[PDB]
Amino acid sequence: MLQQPTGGYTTLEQFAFTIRNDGTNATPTQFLQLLSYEATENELVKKTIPTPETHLPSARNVPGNVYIEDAITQALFGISAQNVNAHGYFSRLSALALPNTSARLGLDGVIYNSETINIPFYDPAAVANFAATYAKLGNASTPRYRADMIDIYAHVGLELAGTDAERAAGVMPVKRAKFDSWEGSLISLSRDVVNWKILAFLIDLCSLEGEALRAFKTRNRDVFRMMLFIMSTAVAANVVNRKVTKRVDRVLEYIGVNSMRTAGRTATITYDLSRHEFAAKFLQLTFTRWN
Amino acid sequence: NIAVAHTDHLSVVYATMSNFMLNFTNNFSGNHATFKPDQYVITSPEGSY
Amino acid sequence: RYHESVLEIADIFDQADFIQTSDAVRQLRALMPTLSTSQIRHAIERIAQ
Numbered sequence: 001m002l003q004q005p006t007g008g009y010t011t012l013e014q015f016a017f018t019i020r021n022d023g024t025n026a027t028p029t030q031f032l033q034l035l036s037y038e039a040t041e042n043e044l045v046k047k048t049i050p051t052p053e054t055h056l057p058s059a060r061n062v063p064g065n066v067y068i069e070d071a072i073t074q075a076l077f078g079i080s081a082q083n084v085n086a087h088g089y090f091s092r093l094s095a096l097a098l099p100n101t102s103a104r105l106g107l108d109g110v111i112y113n114s115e116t117i118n119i120p121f122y123d124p125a126a127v128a129n130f131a132a133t134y135a136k137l138g139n140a141s142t143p144r145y146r147a148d149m150i151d152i153y154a155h156v157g158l159e160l161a162g163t164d165a166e167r168a169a170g171v172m173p174v175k176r177a178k179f180d181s182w183e184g185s186l187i188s189l190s191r192d193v194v195n196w197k198i199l200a201f202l203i204d205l206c207s208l209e210g211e212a213l214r215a216f217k218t219r220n221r222d223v224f225r226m227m228l229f230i231m232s233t234a235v236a237a238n239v240v241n242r243k244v245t246k247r248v249d250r251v252l253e254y255i256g257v258n259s260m261r262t263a264g265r266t267a268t269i270t271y272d273l274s275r276h277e278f279a280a281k282f283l284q285l286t287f288t289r290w291n
Numbered sequence: 292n293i294a295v296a297h298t299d300h301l302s303v304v305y306a307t308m309s310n311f312m313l314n315f316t317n318n319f320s321g322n323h324a325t326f327k328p329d330q331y332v333i334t335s336p337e338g339s340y
Numbered sequence: 341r342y343h344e345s346v347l348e349i350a351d352i353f354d355q356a357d358f359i360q361t362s363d364a365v366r367q368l369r370a371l372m373p374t375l376s377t378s379q380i381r382h383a384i385e386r387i388a389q
Contacts, residue, residue: 117337
């Protein structure tokens with residue numbers, strides 16, 4: 001029954017987000033330094049983000065317990081081909097949104113009906129606010145509710161590849177980002193970033209207050225710029241790798257502009273139609289909370 | 292040509308059968324606007340459902 | 341504090357040749373063993389042969 005000192009569960013060594021590359025294991029901060037980019041002249045301008053709709057879906061009665069956490073990641077950064085998922089037990093979340101409920105949310109990423117014996121879980125009070133915002137992710141494919149899978153991506157590219165000199169004006173030149181690679185590359189970061197404990201992050205966003213939110217956003221604006229990069233190569237138009245003499249570069253076509261089908265096919269992670277609606281519903285919901 | 296032998300001899304049949312030994316749960320439906328099962332569950336604090 | 345019973349069409353009309361009204365027939369009608377549609381059918385049947 002862990003608690004947060006307002007440092008948050010992210011101020012802990014229990015679960016930390018680390019990519020493995022370079023023959024040893026490294027933190028996200030060290031990785032991003034390799035991403036160097038130029039310009040190709042198609043101005044990607046920051047639009048406004050429309051507020052979400054308050055109505056929460058109903059968690060249709062369900063016996064047993066689903067791994068609510070699993071699906072959140074298994075859709076966003078899921079590597080292995082994921083079939084249609086617009087359907088599913090994806091809104092049991094809202095059953096935590098009400099005041100007095102007994103249903104608890106454990107560590108590891110499960111949603112128990114009744115707290116059982118020997119299972120460590122997040123604090124029942126700070127998991128409430130996380131739900132009154134993310135249980136709203138249940139209606140991701142209901143017509144007349146789904147977000148728009150175009151404009152948010154403009155917001156995304158201004159984040160992982162936008163030098164501050166640009167974001168302060170709200171406009172930037174479309175970039176083509178290439179870092180140096182190894183073998184599997186793009187697919188390897190996916191099989192890696194999947195098992196990260198995303199819930200250990202999102203809970204902090206909706207609780208931690210201005211004192212420990214300005215400090216929280218400063219140490220974690222990088223764990224965000226990591227699960228935002230992989231989520232981006234699932235959109236880019238090309239992945240062709242340039243060649244030096246012995247070196248290899250993974251030029252990525254157009255980060256921040258959204259096409260409709262993956263450049264990866266075989267080389268990188270791939271999305272599906274049912275997932276395009278999903279990524280837009282996540283990316284929209286999370287940005288208001290972050291920004 | 293049925294209703295008489297349907298709302299007399301057959302009516303006193305349910306009227307008694309409504310209160311037997313093994314009939315217990317309420318399946319009443321006189322207000323389709325508002326009625327629910329109100330089911331119970333066998334649960335232990337040590338992981339059972 | 342209300343007692344519910346039944347009324348009569350033999351009461352709330354009594355026109356000339358429309359509805360049968362008379363204490364000679366009113367007293368007569370208040371004797372039979374509550375007829376159905378089948379009881380009254382076998383009545384206009386035994387009176388045939």
